[PDB]
Structure 1
Amino acid sequence: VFRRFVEVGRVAYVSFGPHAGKLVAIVDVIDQNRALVDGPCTRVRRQAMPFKCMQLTDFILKFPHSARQKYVRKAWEKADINTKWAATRWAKKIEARERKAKMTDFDRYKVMKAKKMRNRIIKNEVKKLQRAALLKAS
């Protein structure tokens, strides 16, 4: 039950390769397994790129199938995609992933202490709730 379709104008997130972590629009189709791609505002050159590597989102900035890079830059700024991106939850769990790699040892210790406490509180409240449901039953 397909929801996202490869349509000229659709935005894709680059999984791996040289241009990792970058957003980019599908300009055109060559064949079954190879497409013309360009992302002017994110510092990615006009180039070929196979569908294998990419994984498409639910945004479709509108432009003609052969439109030269000018009209794309204007349409991109016009829609203001980058901000809606940063609003998406996706990017947030990406930044979390990265902060977790960046995790310092001192922060790691402060975090362990925070966990320890937050979980003792939860344990207390949950046990009172279970006795409460028994009280409700009784």
Structure 2
Amino acid sequence: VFRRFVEVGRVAYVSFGPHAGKLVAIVDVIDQNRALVDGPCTRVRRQAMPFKCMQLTDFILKFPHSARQKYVRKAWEKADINTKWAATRWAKKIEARERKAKMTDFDRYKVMKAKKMRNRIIKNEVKKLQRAALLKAS
């Protein structure tokens, strides 16, 4: 059973291609494997874009199937898609990946030193929990 559908108004995430990592909205369906998309508030012109480079999200904003740039923009700003996407765990994971890639040598040394102690402490408390469970089960 399916939960995401390709209908007029659903916003989508561009996985690869020129406008990768930007959100577009389905404006009209051209054919089996081509869609008309438009990002008014996110630096994407109106263009045909294949379905293979997109991937749907759980957001739908309403406009007519042939509406204009102004109307798509006002629907976007009314829906607050930028803030909602920023809140989304999907975008949180994306930006965490970006930050980890951007991490430098000094940051790598800091992270190594910190996680050394974090793992040490958590392992000690795990041993404590194991001993508690064993004694209450014996």
TM-score interval, normalised by the smaller of the two chains: over 0.9
Moved over 3 A (4+): none
Q: Structure 1 CA distance, aligned partners of 2:71 and 2:133?
A: 63
For residues 77-105 of structure 1, what are the alpha-carbon distances to aligned partners after superposition, in whole Å with 9 as ceiling and x for unaligned?
A: 01111100000011111111111111110
Question: How far 1:134 moved relative to its partner?
Answer: 1.4
For residues 44-92 of structure 1, what are the alpha-carbon distances to aligned partners after superposition, in whole Å with 9 as ceiling and x for unaligned?
A: 1100001111101111100100001111111110111110000001111
Question: How far 1:128 moved relative to its partner?
Answer: 1.2
Between Structure 1 and Structure 2, how many residues are aligned? 138
% identical aligned pairs: 100
Unmatched segments (≥5 aa) in structure 2: none
Alignment of 1:127 onto 2:121: no
The answer for the alignment partner of 2:95 in structure 1 is 95
SS in 2 for 1:64: coil
Give the TM-score, by structure 1 length: 0.97
The answer for the alignment partner of 1:39 in structure 2 is 39
SS in 1 for 2:66: coil
Q: Structure 2 CA distance, aligned partners of 1:133 and 1:29?
A: 59
Unmatched segments (≥5 aa) in structure 1: none
Question: How far 1:137 moved relative to its partner?
Answer: 1.4
